[PDB]
Amino acid sequence: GSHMKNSVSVDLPGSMKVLVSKSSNADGKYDLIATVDALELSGTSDKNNGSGVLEGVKADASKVKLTISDDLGQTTLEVFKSDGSTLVSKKVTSKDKSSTEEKFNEKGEVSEKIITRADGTRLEYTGIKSDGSGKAKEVLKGYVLEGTLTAEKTTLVVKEGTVTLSKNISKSGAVSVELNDTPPPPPPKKTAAWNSGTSTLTITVNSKKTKDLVFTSSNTITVQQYDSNGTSLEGSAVEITKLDEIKNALK
Amino acid sequence: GSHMKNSVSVDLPGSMKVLVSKSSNADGKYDLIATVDALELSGTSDKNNGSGVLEGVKADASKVKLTISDDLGQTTLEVFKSDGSTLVSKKVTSKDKSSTEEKFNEKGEVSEKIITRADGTRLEYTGIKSDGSGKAKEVLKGYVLEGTLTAEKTTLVVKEGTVTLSKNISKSGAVSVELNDTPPPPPPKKTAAWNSGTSTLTITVNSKKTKDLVFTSSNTITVQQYDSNGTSLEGSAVEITKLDEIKNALK
């Protein structure tokens, strides 16, 4: 790969290496050389520990820039369009093996982002919108949490029955958790009044009369409905002819 | 079948016929003859309209008695054991074609009873016990209602969901109806408190702490239960290793 006479090799975060000249040149700057994805990057630095900025040009004229932090604890690898300013990809890697990788839309704005923690768990963001929202996924050991992203926080949601658990992660990385239980409305209870004089059972639900069941001198049962206000009967009484029709009227 | 010289034939309820002599005998009583189920029954009456009591003896010595009401509106056909007093069957039939038929246990007590109304609907009682209870069935046009019998009333029951409809019929035949709705208890609602200092969500149900969910600095979730009183934690925290275990803890 990269070769430099009278150089020291420096190991970098992200499984990269930079060669730094043992000697400084006329300006007292040190030469830096690195090969990243088979492209040679080069720069000069005031320092000789391996920190600085290295640059190169892909065969398709894309511009590549590798920035190495002063203490060697972090690398930033950026790929631009040929203009040298519209980002195509960006990966920041720290010595503890955590990292942030971004993909960009055609205008150079972040459209996807993967945060890899030092322990290998990940936050994966896709479909990022200009207001900072998007779809979110937290990849943990043994399982994946799903949710959404806003500008201030990532909200991962687990649902079971009527219970919702929300794990919120601020851009700072602070965690806060909430739980909600929204039980369905209790079904309104049927009550009934019996008028022995008219052999009529009047059912009520939610304080409204719903129907009259008449138990006739002919040993039959009829059902008649009330209007939506429960004010008076509507239509005509219907004689029940099968058991399922009694059950239905009790629904 | 039955034959009598100088007699008039009288049609009776229950598709029976009695022959009555045109003349009274020395005592001024009239001869009555009838054939019921191929057995000739005979009696004498003070009256000549066909009312009275006729009796006969089956080939197995069972005693049969047919009583015809004074106005001919009702017949009672009883079959006894040879003692002439332990009932084996009894059928009362009215001119309007309603009827009551009873079967009896070996001690001559009613064990089953069918009431047939003039309109052909029926009440069917089986397994009648000495306290007057038993199983009940009302056979209506198009469907059958099921229930139970007590000494004072027959209670036919239709259930749908949590609703129970009861049709009560007194021994007099008066009808009264009731409805009950017993909704299940509303599921107790989960609530939770978040302690940011300990990154711990504490769930409560029915005013008792149920479990702690800890969201650790290692990007893991642990769950630990409280005792049945909700007083303090029990056992040891268990690390969640799959999504189903989070859902389970939310059940």
From Swiss-Prot, chains A, B:
Its main location: membrane. Changing G142S: In strain: PBre. One of its GO terms (cellular component) is membrane. It is a lipid-anchor. Changing D37H: In strain: 42373NY3. Induces host (human and mouse) cytokine release by monocyte cell lines via TLR2 and CD14; nonlipidated protein does not stimulate host cells. This is Outer surface protein A. It comes from Borreliella burgdorferi (strain ATCC 35210 / DSM 4680 / CIP 102532 / B31) (Borrelia burgdorferi).
